[PDB]
């Protein structure tokens, strides 16, 4: 029998709202260390990598290793019942294919419960490519959100680059072209080994950036001819990564 208890119902809501539009069906791995999600998108262009480690959970129990999946749209539909400060309880059975959510108000007068249905899948997986990166930047979340939401009205691709002066996003389109530069300093910081050029599709960056309210900051780290990472660190419970394959 699996159980998880959390006081921060806001973060569970924010995570599902960051995923509900990018992935329809997803496989969870549940272990003593925490819950894992490691899913592909339908077009097989972006890799979503998630980690919620148990030490930040207010209560946790995993007697049996479990590897359930569920459809994210119907879980997002059920989760809009919870109030912003509600206590969230997750529980499941190791034999049956069902997930029970019970929503507890901050004050104890009302309690809600919800049986979501479940199924088993063995979605294809690919391992984390651990590597060094020549390029890495730390910049605040809202600036990257502004940048993607702005460039998405001009062009179709973002041509990222980095220089001894700072970073530069650039995009071109039917109405015009533009670039945006940030100089090296809530601040921007860069560790830089050698300049590089890439190209990326804004559609997936718009999809990723819905995670904005999870963390005040983001890390873009990358290298030549390999996927770029977009990292959001959750407050003292885990992290969320996205990957996007470079165009050529």
């Amino acid at each position: 029998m699996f159980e998880a208890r959390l006081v921060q119902g806001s973060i569970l809501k924010k995570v599902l709202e960051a995923l509900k539009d990018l992935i329809n069906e997803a496989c969870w791995d549940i272990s003593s260390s925490g819950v894992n999600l490691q899913s592909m998108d339908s077009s097989h262009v972006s890799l979503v990598q998630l980690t919620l480690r148990s030490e930040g959970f207010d209560t946790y129990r995993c007697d049996r290793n479990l590897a359930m999946g569920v459809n994210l749209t119907s879980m997002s539909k059920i989760l809009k019942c919870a109030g912003n400060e509600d206590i969230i309880t997750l529980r499941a059975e190791d034999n049956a294919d069902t997930l029970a959510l019970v929503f507890e108000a901050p004050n104890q007068e009302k309690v809600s419960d919800y049986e979501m249905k479940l199924m088993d899948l063995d979605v294809e997986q690919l391992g984390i490519p651990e590597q060094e990166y020549s390029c890495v930047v730390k910049m605040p979340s809202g600036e990257f959100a502004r940048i993607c939401r702005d460039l998405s009205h001009i062009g179709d691709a973002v041509v990222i680059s980095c220089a001894k002066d700072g970073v530069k996003f650039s995009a071109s389109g039917e109405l015009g072209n533009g670039n945006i530069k940030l100089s090296q300093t809530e601040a921007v910081t860069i560790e830089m080994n050698e300049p590089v050029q890439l190209t990326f599709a804004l559609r997936y960056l718009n999809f990723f950036t819905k995670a904005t309210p999870l963390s005040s900051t983001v890390t873009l780290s990358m290298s030549a001819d390999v996927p770029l990472v977009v990292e959001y660190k959750i407050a003292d419970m885990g992290h969320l990564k996205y990957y996007l394959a470079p165009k050529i």
Binding site: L47, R203, Y204, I248
Partner: protein, 241 residues
């Protein structure tokens, strides 16, 4: 994989191992090689090399590959599915679809541009043809997204032309029926592996070979192909009527 070489061999020039399902990549590569040669006889010889290789490795696989070749079982749905499966934006790629050629050249160029993730499993002709019969709105865009992502090098153009119902490869049903007639003539069915026959016309004169092929073609046209093909591989003017 190429069939355009002079004196090409249906045995040693095949693109797949015996007992492996027929890949669509050799089919697409053939369709573009045919589009590059205006000669109807050189096209027919190319199709005869394909069909001869198909009957040499996968005798059951002839109904689908012929049905695809004859295209026997909207543009906005196609463009929507291409946009959904290739990234960018449906409105932005719709500008790219103007002034250029057909949607297939936008589709193949996009699948060329994104370096993509890992290579998916190659599409087999039986899988493709089975998927098309199920394809004839949300169900449609989902399955068509699965076709487009699987495209390995250049197949995307011929997939799009197949969905548009306007393949226009430069041949017709009677041309491929004759291509099958010389295919079955140069390599008869019911062989025991390894097939000791590879070119039954060897030692016939040019006029004798032309007359023999035309008489074999005359038996095919006079004889639904869905019962013609299994009878042709199992054995004809008495077996069908």
């Amino acid at each position: 994989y190429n069939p355009a070489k002079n004196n090409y061999h249906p045995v040693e020039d095949a693109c797949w191992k015996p007992g492996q399902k027929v890949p669509y990549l050799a089919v697409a590569r053939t369709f573009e090689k045919i589009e590059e040669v205006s000669a109807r006889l050189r096209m027919v010889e190319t199709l005869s090399n394909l069909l001869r290789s198909v009957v040499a490795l996968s005798p059951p696989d002839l109904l689908p590959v012929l049905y695809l070749s004859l295209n026997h079982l909207g543009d906005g749905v196609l463009l929507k599915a291409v946009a959904q499966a290739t990234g960018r934006q449906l409105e932005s790629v719709r500008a790219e679809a103007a002034e250029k050629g057909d949607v297939g050249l936008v589709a193949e160029n996009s699948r060329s541009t994104q370096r993509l993730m890992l290579p998916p499993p190659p599409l087999t002709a039986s899988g493709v043809f089975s998927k098309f019969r199920d394809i004839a709105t949300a169900k449609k865009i989902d399955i068509i997204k699965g076709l487009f992502v699987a495209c390995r090098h250049s197949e995307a153009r011929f997939i799009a032309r197949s969905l548009s119902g306007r393949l226009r490869l430069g041949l017709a049903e009677q041309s491929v029926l004759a291509a099958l007639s010389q295919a079955v003539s140069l390599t008869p069915p019911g062989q025991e592996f390894p097939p000791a026959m590879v070119d039954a016309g060897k030692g016939k004169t040019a006029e004798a070979r032309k007359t023999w092929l035309e008489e074999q073609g005359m038996i095919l046209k006079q004889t639904d192909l869905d019962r013609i093909i299994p009878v042709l591989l199992e054995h004809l003017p008495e077996h069908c009527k």
